[PDB]
Design an enzyme around this catalytic site. Structure first.
Site, mmCIF file in Angstrom:
data_model
loop_
_atom_site.group_PDB
_atom_site.id
_atom_site.type_symbol
_atom_site.label_atom_id
_atom_site.label_comp_id
_atom_site.label_asym_id
_atom_site.label_seq_id
_atom_site.Cartn_x
_atom_site.Cartn_y
_atom_site.Cartn_z
ATOM 1 N N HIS A 155 1.065 -1.176 0.488
ATOM 2 C CA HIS A 155 0.283 0.059 0.125
ATOM 3 C C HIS A 155 0.938 1.178 0.204
ATOM 4 O O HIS A 155 1.175 1.518 1.000
ATOM 5 C CB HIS A 155 -0.610 -0.213 1.368
ATOM 6 C CG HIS A 155 -1.874 -1.439 1.216
ATOM 7 N ND1 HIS A 155 -3.130 -0.771 0.463
ATOM 8 C CD2 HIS A 155 -1.576 -2.746 2.260
ATOM 9 C CE1 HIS A 155 -3.668 -2.579 0.458
ATOM 10 N NE2 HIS A 155 -3.059 -3.138 1.788
ATOM 11 N N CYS B 132 -14.776 10.506 -3.604
ATOM 12 C CA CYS B 132 -14.687 9.869 -4.998
ATOM 13 C C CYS B 132 -14.419 10.717 -6.150
ATOM 14 O O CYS B 132 -14.127 11.977 -5.861
ATOM 15 C CB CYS B 132 -16.778 10.430 -5.607
ATOM 16 S SG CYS B 132 -16.991 9.763 -7.304
ATOM 17 N N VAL B 133 -14.028 9.742 -6.747
ATOM 18 C CA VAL B 133 -13.067 10.666 -8.277
ATOM 19 C C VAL B 133 -13.601 9.883 -9.817
ATOM 20 O O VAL B 133 -13.635 8.837 -9.331
ATOM 21 C CB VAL B 133 -11.480 9.688 -8.025
ATOM 22 C CG1 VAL B 133 -10.650 9.914 -9.877
ATOM 23 C CG2 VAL B 133 -10.971 10.032 -6.904
ATOM 24 N N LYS C 295 -4.749 6.177 -11.246
ATOM 25 C CA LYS C 295 -3.934 7.520 -11.143
ATOM 26 C C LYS C 295 -2.996 8.820 -9.761
ATOM 27 O O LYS C 295 -3.284 9.375 -9.857
ATOM 28 C CB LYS C 295 -4.646 9.342 -12.277
ATOM 29 C CG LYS C 295 -4.755 8.701 -13.976
ATOM 30 C CD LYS C 295 -4.828 9.294 -14.790
ATOM 31 C CE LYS C 295 -6.372 9.166 -15.325
ATOM 32 N NZ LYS C 295 -5.858 7.848 -16.182
ATOM 33 N N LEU D 125 -4.972 9.988 -7.329
ATOM 34 C CA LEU D 125 -5.638 10.739 -7.001
ATOM 35 C C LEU D 125 -6.161 11.318 -5.755
ATOM 36 O O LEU D 125 -6.370 12.401 -4.638
ATOM 37 C CB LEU D 125 -6.344 11.407 -7.615
ATOM 38 C CG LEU D 125 -7.376 12.795 -8.285
ATOM 39 C CD1 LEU D 125 -6.675 14.075 -7.947
ATOM 40 C CD2 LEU D 125 -7.864 12.810 -9.933
ATOM 41 N N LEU E 67 -23.818 7.167 6.897
ATOM 42 C CA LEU E 67 -24.812 7.608 5.160
ATOM 43 C C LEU E 67 -24.232 7.173 4.192
ATOM 44 O O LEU E 67 -23.084 7.109 4.325
ATOM 45 C CB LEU E 67 -25.430 9.001 5.347
ATOM 46 C CG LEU E 67 -25.463 9.346 7.271
ATOM 47 C CD1 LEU E 67 -26.388 11.440 7.196
ATOM 48 C CD2 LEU E 67 -27.201 8.828 7.792
#
Ligand SMILES: CCCCCCCCCCCCCC(=O)SCCNC(=O)CCNC(=O)[C@H](O)C(C)(C)COP(=O)(O)OP(=O)(O)OC[C@H]1O[C@@H](n2cnc3c(N)ncnc32)[C@H](O)[C@@H]1OP(=O)(O)O
Ligand SMILES: CCOC(=O)CN1C(=O)COc2ccccc21
Length: 411
Positions: free
Chosen positions: A2, A160-161, A168, A170, A411
């Site tokens: 990782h 979220c990407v 990438k 990100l 949630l």
């Protein structure tokens, strides 16, 4: 490897979190003064953006991103479609920090490209109960109770990407910028859940599902007809029949929650929640916020007798995009929120939950085996699904606990 998470203040293996005994941080103590004030660096074709979640248009931009790029089931059949009103509710609880809403958008056109959100929660996260036996057996009680006070921490959700920007690296950057934004607020812990496996959960549980409208559910391939309804005549009649529910709540004096119910609900909620190792503490305003009914978002019912609120249940709506299918567009799912029962068996409370949810046109009721959720699985005809919600802390050593020792609904 990782490559990102090995650089982070979380336990790295199962063999770690098995041998952790007391709750406590992972990291060096630090101060707001040690935290850069300038946003983390990013490719020049991108910029950081703080959405204003009290603007229809920012909310919508986040809504579109998630609608199209947020979580999908393993089989890529369904995707979450959190409504706009739901995102306002979830992201703007009382005393929320606007700065904890972190977005990356392209500089050119301002297309939203990634998002992560933090909201405040006050959470009980001191050493579990069983592990506090061990620490009397051994004279270590004050070490064990060190961090028993509810802590004001961050609850991360909605990572979220955009599909185009995946693989990438990100999302690590997103996580470091949130970490930074939250550190500058003098907060050093976070709690989050993932459908996937990360280093390293302190608790994990099955998802459960309960057919409300099995005709749609089979149509959209959420469910199959199980192989034993073949040996039957009109298989879909049996299925409809098995999951059928009364048209009306069974508990006399069930009614929607109102503002005047806030203190009572808070109280019986906190007494109930107090009996779990990990769980939120809510003030009145938080109770108003997360539990007063809102159209299309959250639905809360109480049991009153003798102008006395004895029990409540609540659930929230997340509709899901049916990804294949031309017939149907959406799966209309209800999720078991907080509840508390003092005058009636929990399965009898939650049955009226199923009844309400069905009469309001929900297709399915979902949950995770947190709380005393497991204690009504069989009688209410829930079935386990695929996968597991994992619960994680950032920068907080915590022993592995069972999921019925967790009282935080995500949630
Ligand atoms: C005190 C303050 C602390 C505050 C912050 C606390 C921490 C918050 C933690 C966030 C809690 C979020 C809770 C939720 O919202 S859970 C929901 C997560 N969102 C989705 O599943 C939506 C659909 N998927 C996507 O948008 C992307 O696939 C995501 C964004 C998930 C990854 O983007 P992408 O696929 O383009 O990958 P990459 O190349 O950019 O990056 C690769 C790295 O990312 C690690 N990764 C993959 N999935 C997750 C995941 N769900 N949580 C944390 N990390 C994840 C992965 O191990 C790898 O690192 P490493 O193995 O190389 O080390
Ligand atoms: C087979 C599950 O389908 C759902 O119930 C809806 N759902 C989504 O659309 C997105 O993926 C999920 C992941 C975990 C729990 C629920 C969902």
């Amino acid at each position: 490897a990782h490559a990102f998470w090995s650089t982070q203040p979380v336990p790295q293996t199962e063999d770690e979190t098995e041998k952790i005994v007391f709750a406590g941080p992972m990291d060096e103590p630090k101060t707001v003064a040690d935290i850069p004030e300038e946003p983390y660096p990013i490719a020049s074709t991108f910029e950081w953006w703080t959405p204003n979640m009290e603007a229809a248009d920012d909310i919508h931009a986040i809504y579109e991103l998630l609608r199209d790029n947020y979580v999908e089931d393993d089989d890529s059949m369904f995707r979450f479609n959190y409504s706009e009103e739901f995102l306002q509710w979830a992201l703007c609880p009382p005393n929320y920090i606007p700065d904890w809403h972190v977005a990356v958008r392209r500089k050119a056109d301002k297309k939203l490209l990634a998002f992560i959100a933090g909201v405040p929660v006050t959470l009980r996260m001191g050493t579990p109960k069983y592990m506090k036996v061990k620490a009397q057996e051994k004279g270590e009680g004050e070490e064990a109770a060190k961090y028993d006070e509810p802590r004001h921490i961050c609850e991360i959700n909605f990572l979220c990407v955009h599909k185009q920007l995946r693989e990438k690296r990100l999302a690590p950057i997103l996580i470091k910028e949130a970490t930074r934004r939250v550190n500058r607020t003098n907060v050093w812990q976070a709690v989050y859940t993932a459908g996937v496996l990360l280093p390293t959960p302190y608790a994990s549980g099955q998802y459960f599902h309960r057919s409300l409208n099995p005709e749609k559910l089979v149509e959209i391939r959420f469910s199959g007809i199980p192989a034993q309804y073949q040996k039957f005549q009109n298989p879909m009649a049996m299925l409809k029949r098995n999951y059928q529910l009364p048209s009306a709540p069974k508990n006399s004096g069930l009614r929607e929650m109102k503002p005047s119910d806030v203190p009572q609900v808070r109280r019986i909620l906190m007494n109930y929640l107090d009996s779990f190792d990990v769980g939120p503490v809510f003030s009145d305003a938080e109770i108003s916020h997360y539990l007063l009914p809102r159209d299309g978002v959250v639905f809360t019912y109480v049991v009153e007798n003798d102008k006395k609120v004895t029990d409540f249940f609540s659930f929230y709506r997340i509709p899901s995009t049916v990804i294949g299918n031309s017939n149907y567009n959406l799966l209309n799912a209800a999720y078991v929120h907080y509840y508390a029962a003092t005058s009636i068996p929990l399965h009898q409370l939650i049955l009226d939950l199923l009844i309400v949810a069905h009469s309001r046109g929900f297709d399915v009721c979902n949950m995770v085996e947190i709380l005393d959720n497991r204690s009504f699985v069989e009688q209410l005809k829930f079935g386990a699904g695929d996968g597991h919600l994992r619960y994680y802390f950032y920068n907080w050593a915590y022993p592995k606990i069972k999921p019925s020792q967790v009282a935080l609904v995500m949630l």
